Amino acid sequence: GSLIIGASDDTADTLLPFLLNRVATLYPRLAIDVRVKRSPFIADMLSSGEVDLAITTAKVSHPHVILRTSPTLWYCSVDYQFQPGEPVPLVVMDEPSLYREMAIEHLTQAGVPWRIAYVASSLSAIRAAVRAGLGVTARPIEMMSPDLRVLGETEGLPGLPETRYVLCKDKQCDNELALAIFSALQNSYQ
Amino acid sequence: SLIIGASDDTADTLLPFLLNRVATLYPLAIDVRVKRSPFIADMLSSGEVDLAITTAKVDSHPHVILRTSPTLWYCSVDYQFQPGEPVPLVVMDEPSLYREMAIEHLTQAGVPWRIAYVASSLSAIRAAVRAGLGVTARPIEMMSPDLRVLGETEGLPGLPETRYVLCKDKQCDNELALAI
C-alpha cells in the first residue's frame, strides 16, 4: 500500500512529525508522501483523493480523530511595548485564516479594539514579525519560544479557545491503509 | 558597570534574550548572579546586586512586573497519562517553588501524587520528562517541541500565573535607575 498525508504549515513542524512516528510504528515498511499547503487547499485535496489523510486545526462535517488539545495564546516579542489604552495591532495571515478570525471574534466579543498591523502569507513570516515586535498574534502553545511573551488577563486580552489538532479522512475513503491508521489512532484517544 | 541577580528560572529561559536587547545599549557589560527565587530579594538587601529579577512574590522592595506567564503541567509528547493513578511528579530537590506549587494544588484538589524523579537542574527536569518519568509544573517559557501540556480534561488543576518581577532597593545608583 501507499499513503499520502496532507498537512498545513501550522502542523508541519509540530504534529506532523508526531503522526509520522505513530504511523511508522504501525507500518515500518510504509513510505509516506507529504503535501504541505494552506488549509483551504488541503481540505479540498482530501475530498478529491489527492491526499489519503490530513492533519489540520480547523473545526472539522467529517470523521476525525483528535491527536492533541493545546492552549491558544496571545504572543508578542520579548520587549514589545504593549499598550492597553490602544487597539491591539494584529500580525495575522491574509484572509482566509482561522487564527485571524479567532483573534478577531474574541476581541469583538470582549469589546477590545484592534487593527491589522501586519499581514503575511505563512506561519514563518508570522513568527518572525511577532519576534521582531510588529505586534500581537493568537497561536497555539506549539508556537512558543523563550523568545516570546504571552499577554493575557492582566494586559486586558480575553481567553482563547483551545486548539484541537485533528486527523481527518474522507467520508468515502477506500485506501485500506488510511482506514487502519485512522482506526488505530482512534483506538488510542478514547 | 552593573550587577543583576536572577532566579534560575529567569536565567534558564528568557534572560539572555532580554539582555540581548539591552546589548544594543552599548558597553555597559552586565553581570548575572543566579540563585533560586526565594533567595533573590536578600541579594538586594545585602547590597550584593543593584537590580534583581525573580518569580517569588516580593514582600518589601519596589518592583515592576516584566510579564505574567501561565504556569502549566507538561509531559513528553508520547507520555501516557493514567487518570486512575497518583500523578508521577518530576521535581527539583527541595527547596523548589514549583515543587511546592505542584504539591499544594494537587493536594488541595484531592489529587494523589508521588515523586517519580528528583532532578538537579532545568535541563535535568526536561531530560527526565522527555524520558517519560512523569509530569512537571513550569511556566510557559519552558515550552519546547518535545513537550505537551496537560490539564483540566486530564483531571489536573489550574496553576496560578508566574509573574517575573524586576526589583531595586531604596538606594542611590545612577546606572540602576536607567534600567528602572
Interface test with chain B among A67, A72, A79, by most B beta carbons within 10 Å: A79
Q: Which residue in B has a C-alpha nearest to residue A163's C-alpha?
A: B149
Q: d(Cα A53, Cα A165) in Å, to the nearest integer?
A: 13
**Which value in Å is the resolution of this experimental model?**
2.4
SS3 assignment, position B92: strand
Q: What does the domain layout of chain A look like in residue ranges? A: 1-69+164-190, 70-163
Q: ∠ CA(A187), CA(A98), CA(A124), 5° rounding? A: 95
Dump strand ranges (E) for A111-162. Answer: 114-120, 137-140, 148-151
Helical (H) or strand (E) element with A69: strand A64-70
Highest CATH level, class, for B69-162: alpha beta
Cell of A12: 508541519
Cell 492552549 -> residue = A71
Contacts of B141 in chain A (CB under 8 A): 144, 146
B1-68+163-180 and B69-162 agree in CATH topology: yes
Alpha helices in chain B (DSSP H): 8-11, 15-22, 40-45, 97-108, 122-130, 174-179
Listed in sequence order, the residues at least 6 apart from A55 whose beta carbon sits closer than 8 Å to its beta carbon are: A5, A6, A7, A11, A15, A16, A19, A67, A165, A166, A167, A168
Q: Residue A154 is nearest to which of B13, B68, B140, comparing CB atoms?
A: B68
In 3D space, the residue among B13, B146, B124, B117 whose CA is nearest the CA of residue B71 turns out to be B13
According to CATH, the topology of domain B1-68+163-180 is: D-Maltodextrin-Binding Protein; domain 2 (3.40.190)
Measured in degrees and rounded to the nearest 5, phi and psi for residue A44 equal: -65, -35
SS3 content of chain B, % helix, strand, coil (to 5): 30, 30, 40
Interface test with chain B among A68, A73, A78, by most B beta carbons within 10 Å: A78
Sequence letter at residue A159: G
In 3D space, the residue among A148, A87, A90 whose CA is nearest the CA of residue A120 turns out to be A90
Q: d(Cα A119, Cα A92) in Å, to the nearest integer?
A: 5
Sequence letter at residue B100: E
According to CATH, the topology of domain A1-69+164-190 is: D-Maltodextrin-Binding Protein; domain 2 (3.40.190)
Query: Do B113 and B86 contact (CB within 8 A), yes or no?
Result: yes
In 3D space, the residue among A74, A73, A81 whose CA is nearest the CA of residue A133 turns out to be A81
Question: Residue B115 forms beta bridges with which residues?
Answer: B89
Listed in sequence order, the residues at least 6 apart from A149 whose beta carbon sits closer than 8 Å to its beta carbon are: A75, A76, A77, A78, A80, B67, B69
Sequence letter at residue A8: S
Say whether domain A70-163 belongs to CATH 1.10.260.40: no
